Structure formats: structure tokens, C-alpha cells
């Protein structure tokens, strides 16, 4: 995705402060609480019946770390999210059957979690840069759908 | 909200569909899978080849449910209760997909009702499919 | 955009049967009838109080023809819509203030009108190929928005 | 549909927003104009510069209407009727833009309510804003 030196610089410095283990865990649990229909892809994950249950579930936490660890990789390849995410795109279409619309919801919940965690430092312009990156990543992941 | 005229328009275009409701339903599904492939992610267990019995039976179920909403347009939440619990608690289809099927349905009615698909009927049908999508979506969370 | 040779010949074959002026006025008029909010840019066209008044307004019809002649000329450059529409994108954003969402709505109302006009000849594969073309057009027109 | 727990969450979250409601409404618009630049096509008459008094006064009107929405959570349609008529027949903002502002308001709330923006509160806040959006676009057609 095309970001300005200022956006890139925003995105990078902020992510240097993200503990992926914890944010991925919060991102994925809030996704499952806020838009429960996404729980369809995680039936074998435990009790996802209350916010508390979803949040403390270790499998949700372990997955969220995987998901944002992969997401972290794309940030370092912000110039070619397509080739970076092409194998996972195919994975999610052909084996996981994930409606790519979920990648957008996750991207928005992630922006929320970054706002909640960083508060005041997650300013309007910072948000803007992250908004283009999650839209970038979602598209890159929906790219091999057919 | 559906106007009194919207209801008359819908009952006139649907009445017209009559016995083809099922063939239209299957044609709309084929149109959605071909135009909007991500909707296939909801049917990994179906044979989605053209003419497949599964698509034809599903299309028939889709139309009957639409025929039922026409018949009970003045009280859809209650007429569609069951389907809305099914879409909300079991199938859990993301709500964006409903706009894609309602568009494909509209295209299928356009293609088949040249005399009846006037501007105002088009408008009323679009609103109706919107309301049908709302009702099916209303128990999601 | 991404069209196979067969999709290109299906789009261009049906398009050769199109009366650009008639469909143009019809697609714009249906746009203004089915999604009344889009009438917001056309207060100077006059009477848009009924469907019959919209469809029959010579000013909608003349706008319809202009819009669809530009789309029509766009189909000759399916390999480069961004370049074909870049200035129009710029106009629509900085001078006309047209929310790109409206291009998406017109592209779907256009597909409906070709299905009404062509009937059985507007088969699912043909729809699919026009759906890619009207999403490509909607994307190239929104590309210069800032 | 808003559950009594959702109303409780919304009231508690909103109740904490208190007199900052305006400042947050302005921050929410700014986030919106910067993240989704298409929404600026509706305010070609405003100075959308950070700090703009026009965005502040408008943020303030948006916030107060949401304060009235909260105060009338079991009677929104009626409480928001003139705002619904205004966006439907004069402003005519495409429905798609109400979700972009609802996302920006949610982000502004997350950034200012570290302790109160729990997962459950985030979910009831989204629901509430989707319901506000539904009411304001209900008279479009
Ligand atoms: C948008 C950013 C996303 C990224 C980078 C991502 C990345 C990943 C990775 C790396 C894996 C496999 C882990 C491994 O074997 O190494 C995976 C699996 C999976 N993803 Fe995604 N994912 C994303 C979004 C989503 C969304 C939003 C959903 C659905 C709500 C989803 C559903 C799943 C499922 C169901 C699996 C299989 C998990 C299992 O076997 O337990 N993913 N994803
Ligand atoms: C006009 C809106 C819709 C109506 C009236 C409708 C109607 C129905 C009906 C009547 C069934 C029950 C099938 C049975 O009992 O065999 C069903 C199931 C199903 N629907 Fe919907 N539906 C709509 C929207 C959607 C959308 C947008 C999708 C996804 C793209 C979706 C995906 C499903 C799935 C996957 C099934 C289960 C199929 C099976 O495994 O038999 N539906 N729908
Ligand atoms: C395929 C989609 C579209 C194409 C190709 C397109 C093309 C055009 C063209 C070629 C013009 C005239 C440019 C000039 O003055 O030199 C124009 C102007 C205009 N367009 Fe678009 N347009 C499209 C969609 C829309 C939509 C959906 C709307 C809003 C509902 C819209 C609103 C306008 C307005 C208000 C003007 C100015 C007309 C005047 O000043 O009389 N356009 N467009
Ligand atoms: C949470 C949903 C919203 C609320 C509560 C809201 C509320 C309001 C209020 C209270 C007014 C001023 C009414 C008056 O005092 O005359 C207004 C005006 C307006 N709204 Fe909304 N609004 C919402 C969403 C939107 C959206 C998403 C847009 C477009 C992105 C939009 C565009 C405008 C514009 C252009 C004005 C007039 C600005 C001016 O010229 O003064 N509104 N809105
Ligand atoms: O369905
Ligand atoms: O607004």
C-alpha cells in the first residue's frame, strides 16, 4: 500500500510498542464478542459464550498471537502485501472457507484495541495510517479468493 | 419501512413470478456465486456446478421463504422468526452477503419480468429485499 | 482490470447492442428513483417528484447520456480504467463532491437495466463479467479522492 | 435490539463521557475525515483543518444528539425524527457513511475510556450506534 513517509513512520513506531501476544489476544477476543457470527470459524475452541469466557480462553489468545504475528510480517512488507499474504489468502479461501469480510471487521476491531491500549497517542492521523494498512491487509488476504 | 404502495408492487411482481419462484431462486444463487465468489465460502458442502440438484433445491427453499414474506409482508419479523434464528445462531452468514443476494435476485427478476420491472416496482422490490435482509439479520447479536 | 478474453468479448458483444442514450437515461433515472438520496446533486434538473417525472425529465436523460457515453468510451480501455478516468475522478471529488458510493449504486442499477433490456441473453457469466467492469469503473472513478 | 444490559452499558459509558461529549464528537469527525476521505464530500463548505471551529461546533451537535439518543434509548425513532428527516430529505448522506462515523466514534471512546471500554461495553456501544444509524436512515426511501 502507498503510505506517506509520515504514515509509515507513524505505523512503525507504534507497532514497536505492541506486545503481539497481548494485542492479538484482545483483538481476536473482541472480534468474537462484538461480532459473534465470526465464532462460526472457531467451534473447536472452547466456551465462547460470555465475554469473559471468550477473553480468558487460551485458544483464542493463542490464535490471536498467531494472527497478529503474521500481521506483523506484512507491516515489514507494506510494499507488497499481495505476495506476502498470498499463501494465507489461498489457505483462508480454500481450506478455511473464511468470508473475507471478516478480515475487515478484524481490521476495525484491531484499530479499536490500538486506540484502547494507546489512548491519546493513537491520534487521528495515526489511526488514518493504520486504517489504510488493515484495509491493505484485508485486501491482500482476500486476493486469492475464487 | 415499506409503504402501502411498495407492498402492492411487490405482491404484483411476485404474484407474476408465480410457479417459477423456485427456478428464479436457483438462478439468483448461480448469479451470486459467479458474480460474488466470496459467497461460495458459505457453501463448501455443496456441489455448486450449474444445474446441481442442491442449488435447485436451495433456490426453491429461498423463494418459498420469500413468497412467505410477501404473503406476510405486514408482519415479517414473526413470519421469518425461524429463518432469522437459523441465520443468526447457526449459519451465521456475515450480513454483507445479504445485499449481494438481494442484488442478484433483483437482476433475476429484471431478466424475467420485462413488462413488470418498471422503475417504481424496481424500487419497491429493492426495499423489500432490504427489509427481508434486516429481519433475517436482526437476531445476530 | 482482470478480465479473461472471453469476458471481454462477452462485455463488448452485448455492449454493441446497446442504445447508449436510452439505457443512459434509464439507468440514471432508475438510480434517482430507487436510491432517492442521489437526487441531491440534481436539484437544478427540475421536477423529480415522481418516478414518472424523473424518468421523463429531459435533463436526467441528457445527464444519463453523458454518463453512459463516458462509460461506453471506458469499455475500449478495460486494460487501463484508472488512466481513462483519472481526471473525471479528480473532477467528481474536488468539484462535484460526489461520494464514490454513488458510482457503486449506479453500476448495480446499470447491471439491472442491462438484465431488463436483454432478458435471457444477460446470463450469469455475462452478469459476472459486467459486475467486474462496473466495479472496476467505480474503483477508477474513486481512485483520485483525497 | 438493545438488551437491558446493552442500555446499562451504553448509559454507563456515556455517563462517563459527561461534559467531554463535544470534544469527543469533534475528535470523532476528525478521525472520520482523515481515515475515510470520501466522507469529506459532504462538508465541502467546511474548513476541515485540525482545530477547526466548524468541526468543533458540528462535533458538539453530533454528540448532543447522541446524548439525547442515550437519554431516550427506548424511544429513539421519535427522539431522532427531525434528524432522520434532515439526513433523508435535505442532506441525503449515503447510508454507508453512518458506519464509518460509528467506527470513528468507537475509536474515540476507546482512546478516552481506558477503564470503561471493556469487550462487553465495546459490543453494546457498537450495537447502540448501529441502532442510531438505522433510525437516522430509516426515512430515506
Ligand atoms: C486478517 C488478518 C489475518 C491473518 C494475518 C491471519 C493469519 C492466520 C494464520 C497465520 C493462520 C494459521 C497459523 C499457522 O498454522 O501458522 C490462520 C488460521 C486461521 N484463521 Fe486466519 N488470519 C487473519 C484473519 C482471520 C479472520 C478474521 C478469521 C475469522 C474470523 C480467521 C480464521 C482463521 C481460522 C479458522 C484459522 C484456523 C485456526 C485453527 O486451525 O485452529 N483468520 N490465520
Ligand atoms: C433473501 C435472504 C435469504 C433468504 C430468504 C434465505 C433463506 C434460506 C432458507 C429458507 C434456508 C433453509 C434451507 C433448508 O431448510 O434446507 C437457508 C439456509 C442457508 N442459507 Fe439462507 N437465505 C437468505 C440469505 C442468505 C445468504 C446471503 C447466505 C450466504 C451467502 C445464506 C446462506 C445460507 C446457508 C449456507 C444455508 C444452509 C444450506 C444447507 O446447508 O442446506 N443465506 N436460507
Ligand atoms: C460510470 C459512472 C459515471 C461516469 C462515467 C460519470 C461521467 C461524468 C461526466 C463524463 C461528466 C461531465 C464532465 C464534464 O463536465 O466535462 C460528469 C459530470 C457530473 N456527474 Fe458524473 N459520472 C458517473 C457517475 C455519477 C454519479 C453516480 C453521480 C451522482 C449521483 C454523478 C454526478 C455528476 C454531476 C452532478 C456532474 C455535473 C453535471 C453538470 O454540471 O451538469 N456522476 N459525470
Ligand atoms: C451518529 C450519526 C449522526 C448523528 C447523530 C448526526 C447528527 C447531526 C446533527 C445534530 C446535525 C445538525 C442538525 C441541525 O442542527 O441543523 C447534522 C447535520 C449534518 N450531518 Fe449528521 N449526524 C450523523 C451522521 C452523519 C454522517 C455519517 C454524515 C456524513 C458523513 C452526516 C453529515 C451531516 C452534514 C453534512 C450535516 C450539515 C452540516 C452543516 O452544514 O451544518 N451526518 N448531523
Ligand atoms: O440461503
Ligand atoms: O453529522
From Swiss-Prot, chains A, C:
Effect ascribed to mutating residue 91 to R: In Caribbean; O(2) affinity down; unstable
Effect of residue 123 to I: In Villejuif; asymptomatic variant
Effect of substituting residue 5 to R: In Warwickshire
Globin domain sequence ranges: 2-146
Biological processes per GO annotation: blood vessel diameter maintenance; carbon dioxide transport; cellular oxidant detoxification; hydrogen peroxide catabolic process; inflammatory response; nitric oxide transport; oxygen transport; platelet aggregation
Effect on the protein of changing residue 92 to N: In Isehara; unstable
Effect recorded for residue 88 to R: In Boras; unstable
Outcome of swapping residue 37 to R: In Rothschild; O(2) affinity down
Recorded consequence of changing residue 117 to R: In P-Galveston
Residues with N-acetylvaline modification: 1
Reported effect, residue 143 to D: In Rancho Mirage
Effect listed in the UniProt record for changing residue 81 to H: In La Roche-sur-Yon; unstable and O(2) affinity up
Phosphothreonine modified-residue sites: 12, 50, 87
Outcome, altering residue 97 to L: In Wood; O(2) affinity up
Site-annotated residues for Not glycated: 59, 82, 95
Effect of residue 67 to G: In non-spherocytic haemolytic anemia; Manukau
Result after altering residue 115 to P: In Madrid; unstable
Result, substituting residue 130 to D: In Wien; unstable
Effect of residue 142 to D: In Ohio; O(2) affinity up
Outcome following mutation: residue 29 to D: In Lufkin; unstable
Result of changing residue 87 to I: In Quebec-Chori
Disease: Heinz body anemias: Form of non-spherocytic hemolytic anemia of Dacie type 1. After splenectomy, which has little benefit, basophilic inclusions called Heinz bodies are demonstrable in the erythrocytes. Before splenectomy, diffuse or punctate basophilia may be evident. Most of these cases are probably instances of hemoglobinopathy. The hemoglobin demonstrates heat lability. Heinz bodies are observed also with the Ivemark syndrome (asplenia with cardiovascular anomalies) and with glutathione peroxidase deficiency. Beta-thalassemia: A form of thalassemia. Thalassemias are common monogenic diseases occurring mostly in Mediterranean and Southeast Asian populations. The hallmark of beta-thalassemia is an imbalance in globin-chain production in the adult HbA molecule. Absence of beta chain causes beta(0)-thalassemia, while reduced amounts of detectable beta globin causes beta(+)-thalassemia. In the severe forms of beta-thalassemia, the excess alpha globin chains accumulate in the developing erythroid precursors in the marrow.
Name this protein carries in UniProt: Hemoglobin subunit beta
Organism: Homo sapiens
Curated annotation (Swiss-Prot), chains B, D:
Record's function text: Involved in oxygen transport from the lung to the various peripheral tissues.
UniProt-reported outcome of changing residue 18 to D: In Al-Ain Abu Dhabi
Impact noted for substituting residue 27 to V: In Spanish town
Name of encoding gene: HBA1
Recorded consequence of changing residue 13 to P: In Ravenscourt Park; causes alpha-thalassemia
Phosphoserine, modified sites: 3, 35, 49, 102, 124, 131, 138
Phenotype when changing residue 6 to Y: In Woodville; O(2) affinity up
Modified residues (N6-succinyllysine): 7, 11, 16, 40
Effect after changing residue 125 to P: In Quong Sze; causes alpha-thalassemia
Protein name: Hemoglobin subunit alpha
Amino acid at each position: 500500500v502507498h503510505l506517506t513517509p509520515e504514515e509509515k513512520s507513524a505505523v512503525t513506531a507504534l507497532w514497536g510498542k505492541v506486545n503481539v501476544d497481548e494485542v492479538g489476544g484482545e483483538a481476536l477476543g473482541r472480534l468474537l464478542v462484538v461480532y459473534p457470527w465470526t465464532q462460526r470459524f472457531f467451534e473447536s475452541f472452547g466456551d465462547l459464550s460470555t465475554p469473559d469466557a471468550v477473553m480468558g480462553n487460551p485458544k483464542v489468545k493463542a490464535h490471536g498471537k498467531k494472527v497478529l504475528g503474521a500481521f506483523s510480517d506484512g507491516l515489514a512488507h507494506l510494499d507488497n502485501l499481495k505476495g506476502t499474504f498470498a499463501t494465507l489468502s489461498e489457505l483462508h479461501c480454500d481450506k478455511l472457507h473464511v468470508d473475507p469480510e471478516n478480515f475487515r471487521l478484524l481490521g476495525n476491531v484491531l484499530v479499536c484495541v490500538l486506540a484502547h491500549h494507546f489512548g491519546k497517542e493513537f491520534t487521528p492521523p495515526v489511526q488514518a495510517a493504520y486504517q489504510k494498512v488493515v484495509a491493505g491487509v484485508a485486501n491482500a488476504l482476500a486476493h486469492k479468493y475464487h | 419501512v415499506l409503504s402501502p404502495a411498495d407492498k402492492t408492487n411487490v405482491k404484483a411482481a411476485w404474484g407474476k413470478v408465480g410457479a417459477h419462484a423456485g427456478e428464479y431462486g436457483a438462478e439468483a444463487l448461480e448469479r451470486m456465486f459467479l458474480s460474488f465468489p466470496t459467497t461460495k465460502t458459505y457453501f463448501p458442502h455443496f456441489d455448486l456446478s450449474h444445474g446441481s440438484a442442491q442449488v435447485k433445491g436451495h433456490g426453491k427453499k429461498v423463494a418459498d421463504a420469500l413468497t412467505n414474506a410477501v404473503a406476510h409482508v405486514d408482519d415479517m419479523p414473526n413470519a421469518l422468526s425461524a429463518l432469522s434464528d437459523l441465520h443468526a445462531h447457526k449459519l451465521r452468514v456475515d450480513p454483507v452477503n445479504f445485499k449481494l443476494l438481494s442484488h442478484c435476485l433483483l437482476v433475476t427478476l429484471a431478466a424475467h419480468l420485462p413488462a413488470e420491472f418498471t422503475p417504481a416496482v424496481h424500487a419497491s422490490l429493492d426495499k423489500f429485499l432490504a427489509s427481508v435482509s434486516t429481519v433475517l439479520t436482526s437476531k445476530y447479536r
